[PDB]
Write a protein that binds this ligand. Sequence first.
Ligand SMILES: [Zn+2]
Ligand SMILES: [Zn+2]
Length: 590
Amino acid sequence: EGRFQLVAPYEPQGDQPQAIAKLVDGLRRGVKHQTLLGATGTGKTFTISNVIAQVNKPTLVIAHNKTLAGQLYSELKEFFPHNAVEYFVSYYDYYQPEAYVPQTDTYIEKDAKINDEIDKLRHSATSALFERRDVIIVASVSCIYGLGSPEEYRELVVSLRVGMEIERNALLRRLVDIQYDRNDIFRGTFRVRGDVVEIFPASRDEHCIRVEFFGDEIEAEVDALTGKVLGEREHVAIFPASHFVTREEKMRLAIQNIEQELEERLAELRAQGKLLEAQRLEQRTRYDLEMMREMGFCSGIENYSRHLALRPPGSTPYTLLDYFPDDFLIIVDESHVTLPQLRGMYNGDRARKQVLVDHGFRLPSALDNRPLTFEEFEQKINQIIYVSATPGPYELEHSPGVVEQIIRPTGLLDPTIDVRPTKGQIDDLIGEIRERVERNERTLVTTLTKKMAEDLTDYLKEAGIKVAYLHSEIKTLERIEIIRDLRLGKYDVLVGINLLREGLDIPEVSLVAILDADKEGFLRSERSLIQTIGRAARNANGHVIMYADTITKSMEIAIQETKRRRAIQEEYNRKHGIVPRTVKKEIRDV
Ligand SMILES: [Zn+2]
Ligand SMILES: [Zn+2]
């Protein structure tokens, strides 16, 4: 199995073709790193898919938060309905990352809830990498996290076929060995028939937990359901219901080794400190040890992963990247944000666990169960393509120039930008807002301080304007509920501190004021300004007013870059006879 087949109603237009073709040629010529400098509004995902389709490579796509990853998932499901599209997120984006606050002497327990749906896809994702080569997995930063090993997974595989002879209680045990998927209560699970022709309905095998259930009748298996049969199979392969499954024999040795260190660190801890002496871990360690030799698992098994794997201390973890074939493709979405996040994962994780080993709530060995360092992420890269409108320094330095893709299909342009003085900035901006109102268009205003905004908001009302808010964290449900309100005429202007807040792309917005354009801050950086300038590119009369006293380096670059893109798009609309017009959108609701 190995054929990618991209299904789109439309076709590569604007400047995708050169971008696709160029990226594709860089893959084949063997370039390690490439960058897709693409403006929002162009068909960024479609372009990436086309690349994928053309090279026929199993690929991982890295989003930097639960939502974007989800968005690429559905989108990429659509582009590839007849292929292996997977979702690999985790519980890293929620639940207490078990740590300890010394000063406040207040312990936090790993308190999480396995959202079963995820687990399904994790497992279907981890399985598919062994069935077909036509696989695409969307994932968060989690993909660089400590997972089980890959071979001791492909190795713990229960291969079922017709003609082969296996007890009705042999396969039953080869099954419990792998932390049993559908071998328990709710019912006899897979118990029925028996003999040299049994029932065995291997149902909840998480890598298909959306009612699939494989039923095999002594080498004579066929897919089924919660109702009845469907699609007859000759060969089926079951995957370990867990990512961290260890063979009894290795577990017996790991248990010893844990002990040789739960002990020998007590000797080193005894001599040095007097933190409960050293001891105090005994309650959960020995508790966990007993829970391991009396049952394959235990509380937070993850913490023993290096031991269970039987590898040397300091060893580099096993991760989703290691489940992939030797020559996969990685695509980093919003790479100017995703990469920095990725690289800061280890420090943060080590910090929060160094402490846990200090109040002896975990042993040193627990430090070996962590995310990858950036250097280790690099060493595991075969070939990557970074996607971003404003690529970071790592992407630009490691890739040979950039592959551009700035032409949107409606020919909408990057806005014009005016930079004006701060003296009179408020009455000046009001004039410009009133006009937008008359023309039936909305403004978006950004300030640096959360109190200069409050100030401005109230000022605008005093001018008789339908102003938006001031509060940064106004939930997520009342947020989507104010945007909608703004793109309907409820309000005309909208004041926020951070306009990079996902969900502000609004075709009715024609003006964007930036109030302390030349002030230091993350949100006034070169990349941040360009990203903000882009909130006025969704409209044919898009304009940007920057209020400032000076032209910073950040402002220069941003202004020069927008200009360069606008000229280019304008010439393209000229050579092709396109007249810029605003993409309409449906005003839905909640
Ligand atoms: Zn053309
Ligand atoms: Zn380098």
